[model samples]
Each structure stands twice: as C-alpha cells, then as structure tokens.
Target: AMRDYTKQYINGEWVESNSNETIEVINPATEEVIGKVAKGNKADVDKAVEAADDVYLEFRHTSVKERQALLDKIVKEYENRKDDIVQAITDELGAPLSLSERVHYQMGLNHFVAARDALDNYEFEERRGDDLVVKEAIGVSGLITPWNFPTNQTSLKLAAAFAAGSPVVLKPSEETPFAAVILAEIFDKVGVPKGVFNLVNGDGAGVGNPLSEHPKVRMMSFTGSGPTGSKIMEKAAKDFKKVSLELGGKSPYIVLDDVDIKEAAKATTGKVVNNTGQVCTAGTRVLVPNKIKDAFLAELKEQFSQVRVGNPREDGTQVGPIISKKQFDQVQNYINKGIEEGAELFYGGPGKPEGLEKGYFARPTIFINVDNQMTIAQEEIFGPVMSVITYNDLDEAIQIANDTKYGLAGYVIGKDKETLHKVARSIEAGTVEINEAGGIEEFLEVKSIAGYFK
Candidate 1:
C-alpha cells in the first residue's frame, strides 16, 4: 500500500496544508518515491502556532495529575500502533528491520513511558524559605526534529512538552513524516485536547523558518545540523524565545595506552557502526595510543568488513543505505577529501557497495593516520565512516579529542580507573562516554517566580 500523505495534523484534526504543493518521500534503499507529503508554508505554520498558543494558555494551568494522565494515554495509544511505526521507519529511514523493530520504535515508546512514570514524584511546587516556588509551564513549543532518529527525537520533545504542560507546534523533518503523522494520530486518539499538539509537515524554508520565529511560539527546541540549529537559535532570539538545541558532533572514541585493545575496539566500533553511523553522537574519531596503533587497526578492519551493507529489510544487514542521495554524496565527498588531505585509506572508500548500483548505499569507510584538521575528521559526515588518529601521550589524546568545535560527545577506554576519570574530565564535549552530550534534558527550562508582599 502507498503511504498516506494527504493531510497535516492541526488542532487535533487532519486537514490540508495551506499549500497544494507536495514533496516526494523517497525510499533511499530502493531509489523510489514512497509517497508525497503536503509541503506546508508560513500560512499553515501560522494556523498551527495559533492553535498551540490557544491551547497552551489553558494547558499551562492543567494540574500535574491531569498532564500525567494525558501522557499515560499517549503511551497506550503509541504501543497499540507499533506495527505501523516500525514499518514506516524501515521503509523511509532505511533502517534494518531488526533495528527498526527492536530499537527505533521502542525509543519513542520508552520516552512516553519515561515521562509518564516520572510524574508521580516530580516536584512542580515547593517552598524555599519565605518564597513559594511553582515550576509553571513555559509556553507554546516550536519543535523541529531531525530525520536520523525520527521518532525518538520527536517523542522526547513531545513528551517533555506534555510533562511541562506546554502545547507544541511540531515540524518533523520533511524526509520522515509517517511516524510523526502516526504520532499525531495517537495524540488525537488519546483525546489530548484540541490544539494541544499540532504537526505541520514541510521543509526548513517553508515551515521551519516561520515556526521558529512565530511570536506565540514562546520556546523552540530543535535537533539537527549545527548550522541549521544556529540559524534557528538566531531566529528564536529575535523574540527572546527560550531555545533548546541538540546539534551536530564530531565525537571522539579514545583508546588509551592501557587495557585490552580487543575489548576497546569492540565497544567503540559497535556504536560507530550502529544506525550506519548516521548518528550525532557516533564515535567517529578513534584516538589510539601509538603503542597499540597497528593492533587496534587490525581489529577495526575486521569489524568494519563484517558490517554488511544490503537491503535494510534483511536480517543480519547491520549497515544500510544513507537516508538520501544528498547524504550519500556528502559522505562520498568527505571520503575523497580525507584521501586528498593525506590520510591513509585503511579500508573502504568512496562509492556504492559492490552489487548495488540503484540505491544510495555507501561502503563502510575508515581512514587511518587522520589529522584532526582534515575535512572528514573535523566535520560531521553522518555516515559509516571512521577516522583513526594516533597520539603519543595521554595529554595529546585528550587534546586531540577536545579539538572539534562541536562539543556533543566523547568516549574513552583504559584499564586504570583513575586515568579514565581523568580523561573524561579533560574532554570539553557536553557528554563523554565510558558516555557535551545532548539528551532529552534540553527540552526543559527553569523559571523562577519571585515571591512578593501582598
């Protein structure tokens, strides 16, 4: 059956967008148009934002018990619709069936349950000295999610808004809409109140720009590329709106001077290969001590070769095609750039996988002797590509790991517990692994209401 792309969910109803124009959603694995989604414009966003604002006014006053109940209903509705969600993710996202079924769909489901369960003991109101503190609802949320983890990203934002009693106008990536549409259906089915949640499907220019800048959208939470996140941040700043950004990362996976190289390789390479390395927190930079460079290199080669790039629906196909032709080309360009910048091609290179010509698949790629300054090493390729950089001293390893401008995440491997803690502390990223790293926490903002004399 062809996937439905007939309407946008606005004000708890399925309705046509302001524009008759539509864009095709391609299945990158098959190189076929799966369906078309209505390309909404500024007018459509205005309607959605107004709906969110109107609901947010009253939703803000809803009791914690009431909001939790709503979230509970959401969890039930989502679980009931699991099959459709898994299928949609596998088809549009090109995620392997095992991954889509076992991981992707559950990520969205788990967050709803997480948010709902946390409500019982959560503190919405408390007293500090003479001041009566109430953690009031922020306001209407303009949520712009990325395509990589389509359902998870949207679910987190939506769940946070529900927990905070903030109505949301969600703009899912144009590349993936089926899951978002289905989520809209779940909200409506759960009777989430008219206008409490609205989804307008459109590209960045058409809907994202206006949605980010809308006056009534008091807060904006976005997850995607750093450049786009910065642009949205600037837009949200115009009205001094509360902003949350889960942007790009050139995360480091460091292998220290000590410990079992095999264990470290398995641990680090496993995460890098997952989601075909199209992850913001993917440990792409594999920093190793020069002592174990060749040993680690051998392990990585075996692991990368075992990564099977094939039809996403097939079992044992851990590696799948890039999400789109654009992404495929982008990954290939970076691969070529790595070689051009004097990095050694340890294994895998630019091009389609053997026996595959019609799809947007890329070879599982790795580059050795990578300079931190190289294009592939510095940029977020968002593909099945890894850069192996060797450092002499422990301090140099930490220095190389902290070199990237994108401080999203980091990882370290070592036998000594003290050194592990030391390395973790030295890393400048938001999150360093053992896990800055962005999480669902960004969706929340604190407000202090000052107590006054009567």
Candidate 2:
C-alpha cells in the first residue's frame, strides 16, 4: 500500500492541516507518484511556531546531561530504522540503491554523531578575569532544508538546534519528504518531548516565508539555492532574524600533474557524477594541468565509460536520472549551451542515454577545452555534468579555481601533502561553519558576569 502522508506533523502529533492542499512526490526513475505531502499553508506554520515557542520555555532549561541522553536515544532510533530510511530516499530521490545505502543514509547518521560527539566537551560557560561568559538557547528556530540530500540537510540544522536545546519548526523540501517523515517518526519514537521539534511541509511562499518572517522565530537556517536564500534573508532582515544559510556553489576540483592520471581520473569521475551530480558540492569544475590535459581527458573517458545510468534499484547502476523534468530541462540546456559555445564535447551529450527512453535521465556529460567563463563552467548544473578547464601552472590553477563566486568546497590532488594543505588553505571560502553545535552557542547572547570574582 502506498503511504499517504497528507498530513503535517505539528505540536508533537501527526495531524490534519487546515489548508487541505497536497503535493505529489514523484519517483524520478519511474516518473510515478510514490507519495504525497500536505501542502502546508501559513496557518500550519503559525501553529508549528507556537508549538516550538511553548516548548522552548522548558527545553531551553533542560540540563546538558538530559539533552545528551535524548540525543543518545535519537541516535539509537536512527540506527534502528536505517534500512527503512534508505528505502524512502531511494524511492523519492531516485538515488541508486547502493549509493543511497552507502552515502545518503550514512550522511544522515553521520551528522547526528558529529553533533553528539561535539557536545561532549562543549563549554556553556567560560571563565575570564573576574568575569564568566554565559551561553543560552537563542530561541525557537525555523529550519528550512533542501531536497537533494533530504535527510542530512535537515540533520545539520536539527542536530545543531537540539545541541543548543532550542525548539524547531522545520520545513523540508516537498520533493523528498518521505525520508524526513521517517526521521520525524524516529524523533517521536525516542520520546522527545512534545513541541520541541515540529515539521511542516510545503513550498517557499507557504511555509518558508512564514517561518522566516514570523516574530516568534528568533533564527532561521536554510540550505538550498542562493536565490531562495537571498529571498529568505530579505524577509528575515525586516525583523533582523538570525539566519544561517548553506547556499549554492560551483566548487572546483583541481588536478595537478604529479598525481597518477588513471587513479585520479577514476576518483574524480565517480564523485562528480555521484548522486547524479545533484550534490551542492559536487566539484563540477575540474581543472587539469595543461601539460597532461589530453592524458587526463582520455582517462576520464575510459573511466566514465564504465559508469552505468539507469534504474536506481539496479545492483550496479552508478548514475540515476535527474530529479524532475524541470531539472532535466535545465541540465539539457546547459549541455546545449556548451555545444553551442565551441567547446569540445568530450563525452556524453544532450538527451537521454542509450537505454533510458522514458525517465528524466541526462547523460553523464563532460566538456573539455572549456573556458573558465563558459556557461557550463560558471553555472550550477545540478545534474551529471562536469567541465574540464586547463591551466598552465600551479598559480594559474589556484587563480582559476577561485575565479567563480561560489566557494562551498574545493579539492586539491597532488603528490605532496604539504603543498596540497597550503593550496587548500589558500582557497577563499573556509567551507566550515565552525559555529556552536551544542549546549547553546549560536543561540546564546553573550554576556560577562563582570567583576563577580572581585
């Protein structure tokens, strides 16, 4: 029986929505409706915010030990339902069974562990000369997550919020709601107190805007496109709501001449097209040394030919279809633009792969002799596509790597660890939030207990 998730979880219960609207969850591989989520309205968001606020008054006061125990239980529950969660992602997100099992589900578990481990030694109070600085839960938080890495995108915000002992009103992307629903079930089963964590599902204007703009919500954490983040920030600015955004990126993957061409080729090709190239930090821009550019391109083709794109459930499928028709069309357009721009169509091209006639699949594409300014190199094509940019020397590669506006992630492949570390540090974006994840850091308003020792 197909699961009908036509209700949102609010106030610690799976309840009906006043909106009575619904959105279909499509299986990209089969182009079928796998599930449906309630098309939550502003009213639903309002109730969720109220629920979180009501709980925050108590949850914020919970001792670190108690919250840590709760975290331990939640992690246990996550482990219990691991297989079910993996299936949900595969069904709705078109993730390959192996990839979903290994990467997607693992990511969801990993973040919670990271947050939990970090909480072990987190200091809520620090001592200074005759003054002790204090940290407290910020307030009720609104966390909006993206669809690409459905469960884990949520983990970053939810784990951080729980670590801070702050309550949350969450809005997960409509495209991948099943995995989140499973997680919410895990939270509920672990006996997490009512209203401490609430989930409302819908599009941007409905749930996202209300969550970001509501006066009751003190902070908003968003993970998605830069355009969407900008809009959320704009609304949040009116009330000066604290906002944390993990937005878009066109990250670089630099290949120096020293590394083994064949091995590097395999690793780079596998990752770029991994998740069907839908990852925010997929390292889409590949920079190769000019002296060995042709050798690298040949290696790419030889390794890429071994990749298979088809049904996500298949045992050996490496790549899967684009998430939707909208995504498919956008990726296709970029592939077309690359062809029109006089770049070399090294491998894969516009349209579906040889066997996939029905699904929204885009061939795992590569373009060589690509200029740094080409549309393929500059844009965030969230599909199985990559561009190869040639560089003269180490300095030029570093400069070209940092040329784009995005700095979410970058990779340096070379024989020397010291040089790689030096190059890695030189890249502009740190890519680490390095913020407080446990026992109230971000939410805490810093104040010194001044002259107490005096």
Candidate 3:
C-alpha cells in the first residue's frame, strides 16, 4: 500500500505541518518509495508541546484506575489494527513478515499489556508518620524513537507515558513513520484525550532538536545513537528537564570452552542475524578461548552460511534489508575496515549476497582472528557483521568484554551454572543474559508533601 500521511497527528487530530514539505519513506527491500509523511518543523514541535502541556495539567490528576482503563483500551484497539500494523512495519522497515509479525508487531502489543498490568497495584500516594509522600506523573514528555524497531520502540515509551498520566509529543524517525502514524490513529480511535498523545514526523534538526529544547516539555525520553542522545541532553540541560537515554552497544558474547562448538556457534549466530543485526543489544563481539578457536570457527562458518537473506515478505527468509541505502553503505565500510585492519574474513565478505544486488541486503559477514583493538571490535557496526576475538583465558575474556565504552548488554553461554553466574556478574553491562533474556521505571517522579497531616 502506498501510504501518504500528509498531516501530523497533533492535539488529538490530524493537522497540516507548518513546513510545506514531505519526506518519502523507502522500502529497503525494493529500493522504492513506499510512503510519505509531512516533514514537521520546529513550529510543529512547539504546537505539539503546548498541547501536551495544556492536557498534562488535568491528565496528571486522573486516577490510576482511569489510566489503567485507557491503557487497556489502547491494547484492544492495537489488536484491532493488527493487519495494518504488521504490513506497515514489513513494508516501511523491511523486516521479514515472520519477524514483523512475531517480533516487531507482537512486541508493540506486549508493551501496552505490560503497562496496563503495572497499574494494578501501583501506589501514587502514601501516608507517612507525619506527612504524605507521593509518586506523581513527571509532566509533558518529549519522546524521540528510532527506526530500527519502530513499533516496539515507540510503543514502549508511549505506553509507559500513558500509564504514568504524562502527556506526550512523540517524534518518530523519518525513515519509518507509517507505523507511528498508525499508532496515532489507534490512540485517536481509542478516544485518547485531546493533547494527551501527539506525533510529529521529521529528521533530527527539523523536529528532534526543537522537541528537546522545548521549555514546556518537562521530560525527554530518547532511544537512538549516542551522539544524538548527547546532543539532546545538552539541549535539555538548559531547562534541567529529566532525560532518559538508551544508546548504542557493542555487546560481547563470551563462549566458554566447556560448551559444545555447534551449540555456541548457533547461539551467537542467532543474535547477529536477528533483525539483520540492527538490534541495539546484538552480540557482535564473540569471545572464544584460543584452544577452541579453530573448532568454533568451523562450526560458526556453517551457521553463517545457512542464514537466508531475501525478500522480507517470504516466510523462508531469515534476514532482510539493512533499513536503507545509507545504512547498507555503512555496513559495507565496516566490513572493509575489518579487512584493512588484518582481521580474517572467515565466512562472508563485503557486499550483497549472490543475486541480491537489487536491495540493501548484506551478507552475514564474520571476521575471525580479530584483535580486541580493531575498529570492528570497538565500535557498533549495527549490521550483520560479527567479529571473533580469541582470548588466552577467562580473565582475558572478561577484560576484552569490559574494554568498550558501552555497557548496554552482555551474553555468556555455557553449561556450568557457577561459571555462567560468575561471568554474568563480571560483565560490565546493564543487562547480562546467561543464555538472551532481559523493565520500565524511568517515567515517574517522587514528591514529599511536608506538613500534609497538619
């Protein structure tokens, strides 16, 4: 479907953008323009923030039960638009239909349900011995979400904001805005109050900077690149607005000698190939013991070869396009950098797979004998590229894992429970998955109401 969303969803209705421009949404698989949305500007951001602030004054006074009902209604309406959402994500983001439905679309639905259930026993107010303490909604929130997982990322922030009774002005990534526009339609259909939820579609300069710098927006929740997150922080610092940032990661997956080579290779390969390695927490750095390095690579090569990169609409395709042409070029450059830095191209090399020259698809490349100091090991490629670095011992493995600046996530795979727990504890990351398993508490504020009993 050629979706042309010519208006921004602001103040509970679709309105024309102040800027007389529209951004084309591309299908990464076909390299075709699949849709278009109004290019929002600073003026649009101001309008949305003012609306959100106006509604927040009354929205925060709403009871938990009322908010819970609103979330529940959103969940219901979200299910009602299941077909439109799944199709939108597959077309706009080029995620496989299997992945789009099972992972992206389902995760979007899960957030609403999770947020709704969280309100069941949450306490907003409590009485102390001589005073009242309260946890209140922060205020108008400015949400900036990335395009990698459009539905999942947007809903995760939006649902939590709604549950907390915080009105919001959301800026979805220009690369993938249709799913968010569909979300705005869902909110409207569910009778979400005027100004409680708003969406403006545009690039970083046009919409993101203005939203971050808006004075009325009391809080900023952003999930994207580190540089952009830092820029948002600097802009938000002027008003001291509360900031929540989820940035990039070069997560390490340490494979112990105790584990079977085939199993370990499969586990590591799954992480790198999923979402075509667009995931923020993908295990791009694989640490293996020097003794078992040869055996692991033999099996790892087989695993990479089996990854089917083709049309996302097909059920058999495992990996799809790399979001866009720019991202595809970046991935190719990283592959070239690895070769230039003396890393062995063990499995796949730089370029599209055989006969896949039409789309932005990349081969699931693996670089073996990689040094920890190599550029591929330190930076986030954010594509289907994995680097295997050999470690002398367990201590060296842990050392290499902690050397990176990012600590978003880590992975440890083995049979020994004690060893797994030890490695999991030692990894310096916010989340360490023993086998790949991984919360929302950053949206509320605490208040001490002194002399309330008096």
Candidate 4:
C-alpha cells in the first residue's frame, strides 16, 4: 500500500503545503514508487520558521526538568514506532531489515534517551565572581538533514534542539521523509507544544535555501554533501546564524601489519558494506601496509565474496541497492573511473548483482592498488565501493588518511594499543575510532550575564 503523505506538519497540525507539489518516494530495492511527501516551498518555510520563533521565546525559558520529561515522553513514543521506522528505512533507503531494526531504528530511540539523560547534570548556568555565565538555546533552529540515516540524523538534531528548548523547523530530505513524518507524529502524540516541532518536506531549492536565509532562524543544522553544506553556510552567513554542519567524508581505515589479517579484512569489509556504504563516516579508503598488502587483499576478497546483495527484507542480505537511479548511476561512474585510473578491480565492479536489473543495485566494489590521488580514492562515493591504498609505513598511512579535504571520520585497527591510539590521534578528522568508540555537545551557545551578585 502506497502512503500518500500530502500534508506538512506545521505548528502542531497536519496542514496542506502552500504548494501542491508532491515528491514521490521510491523503493530502491524494487525500483517502485512507494510513497509521496508534500513538497514545501518558501511560503511553508516562512510559516514553520515563524512558528518556531514564536514558541522559542517561551520554550527557552522552560525549566530543565520540564524539558527532560518531554524528552522522556519522546523516547517512549519513538520506541512505540520501531516497526514503522524499520520498515520505512528498508523500503525507502534499501537498508536491510535486520540492519534497519538493529542500527537505524535503535539509534533513533537511543538519541532521545541520551537527550533525556543528559539533562540530569547539564549545567545551564555557572557563577563567576559577581557574574553569571549561561548556556541558552540559540532559538528557531532550521534543520536540513540528508536522505541517508534519516531517523538517526533527524532524531539527534531534533532531540538536541528540543533539549535546549530551541524550537526547530526541520526539512528532512524528500528522499527519506517517511521516518521523519513518523517522528512528527510521535511529537504530536507526545503532546509537544504547538510550534515546538515543525516538519516540511522538500528539495534544496524550495525549502532549504529559504529556511537558511530566513530572518527568524538563528541556527542552521545541516547534514549532507560538502557542496550543499558549503551552500548552507554561505546563506547562513548573510544573517550570521549559528551553523552546525555534518558533511561528507572520504575517511580512511588503516589496517596495521601487526593486526590479524583476517580480522583486519573483516573489519574493513564491514566498514565498506554496512549501510551499503552510504554512511558519511563510512571508511571507503582502506590503507594497508606494503608488506601485508597482498595477504590482506586476499583475506578481504574472501570476506567480500561472502557478502549477500539482494532484497532488503532478506534475513541474510548484507548489502542493498543504492537509494535511487541517479545515485546508482553515480556509483557506477565512480567504479568505472576507478578502473580507468588503473586500480585493480580486486572484487565485484561496474554493474548490479545478477537478477537485480529492475532495481537500482550496484555491486559491492573494491579497487586495490589504488593511488591516494585517484578519483575513487579521494572522492566521497556514497555507495558500497572501497578503494584499497597501500602505504609503506605509519607515517605514509597517516599522510594518506589525512590527504582528503574532508575530516568527518577515520578508523585504525591494530593489536598494539599505543600505536592504535597514536594513529587515531594523528588522523585529521572530527571523529576517529581506534577500535569502536563514542557523543554530542555541538548545539549550544555561551552567554555571560554580568552584575548578578550586585
């Protein structure tokens, strides 16, 4: 049954969009139109922003205990919608059902819980001599999230904004709007105050540009491609709005020679295949020591061969289709580019898996002996594509890892604790994982109130 989501959630009500346009949502696994979301325009953005701005004046002054309770209710409501969220993710984004349930849905629930718990000791105010320093909400946040990790990205940003008492006007990617719609339903059911949470579904030109340029919007939280993030920053600069951007990544995963080859291969394969390599932090670049390069590639090939690419609902399917026809074509171009650049196609490449001609499926590709400057090696190919680059030593490995313009994430796998820590520290990314590591304080502002003790 196709879901015709014709109305936008504005000011705590399901209202018709000013523009009657509807964006069709396609199921990547089946190449079918599964749903439709209202395509909002600048008029809608203005309405949502006005609502958020109106509410923030009072919401920002709410007691921490009150906001904490609200988050608790949201967490509970999110738990109630697990089945719908999991199905929506699998249907729209081609995430395997098991992965959707375990990671995608659970991460959404976890964000609200985290927000609820964080308020227990979160200090909003501190006294210094005769003055007071306060951390307050930045008011009327405009959130533009990406299609990938719809729930996770939306939840984290919405939860943070809610916790800070900053009402938000969210424009979830039109490609993955169902999960966010469900979130709006959850907020509505939880009795969130009118104007506290508003969701508008639309493309970048329609809602995104206007939202960023809105006079009432004090903050802009965006998660997407580097180019788009840069555009948002440019627009936000006009008003000097606080911008929190989680952009693209060409993160590197280093497999030290000391680590077990099979284990390193397994870890590297997981990094590339998980989420169909759509995660911004997906380590698409695998750096291996020159001495163990052949051995590691052999192990990695064995691991990749066992990966199952099929329908997302299949229990054992490890990889799913690219999110859209446009994305599939882009990924295929990157694979061909890798081949043209002389990288050895160590594993699957250039086409969809057999029997998947109807859908937008791209093979889980791996290119070994890749130069760091190669197109596939340096670009953010948001798909199940891996570029295995060789390095002679730790210095070269670190150099290759930090060579990209992006600095979203990096990973290091090894036995020696000190070396792993050192490599993780040396990476020029915002988040680096030695094995598997963890949290959120990016959405806030500091203000000092003087002469309080007088």
TM-score of each: 0.95, 0.94, 0.98, 0.97
**Best by lDDT, which number?**
3
Worst 10 residues of 2 by lDDT: 431-440
lDDT of 2 by residue, 310-341 (tens): 99998898888888888899999999999998
What does candidate 4's lDDT look like per residue over 111-180, in tens digits?
9999999999989899999999988888888998888888888999989988888899999988889899
Candidate number that wins on TM-score, 1 or 3: 3
User: Order the candidates by lDDT, highest first — what do you get?
Assistant: 3, 4, 1, 2
How many clashes in each structure?
7, 0, 0, 0
Candidate 3: list runs displaced more than 4 Å: 436-440
> Model 3 compared with the native: what TM-score?
0.98
* lDDT tens per residue, model 3, 45-158: 999999988889699889889999999999999999999899999998999998888989999999999999998988788999879998878989999999999998799999
User: Which candidate achieves the best TM-score against the true structure?
Assistant: 3
Q: What are the per-residue Cα lDDT tens digits for candidate 1 across 147-217?
A: 89889989988998898888889888888888898899899888999888898999999999999889888
Q: Which is the winner by TM-score between candidate 2 and candidate 3?
A: 3
Clashing pairs in 1: 408-436, 429-436, 430-436, 430-437, 431-436, 431-437, 432-435
lDDT (0 to 1) per candidate: 0.86, 0.85, 0.91, 0.89
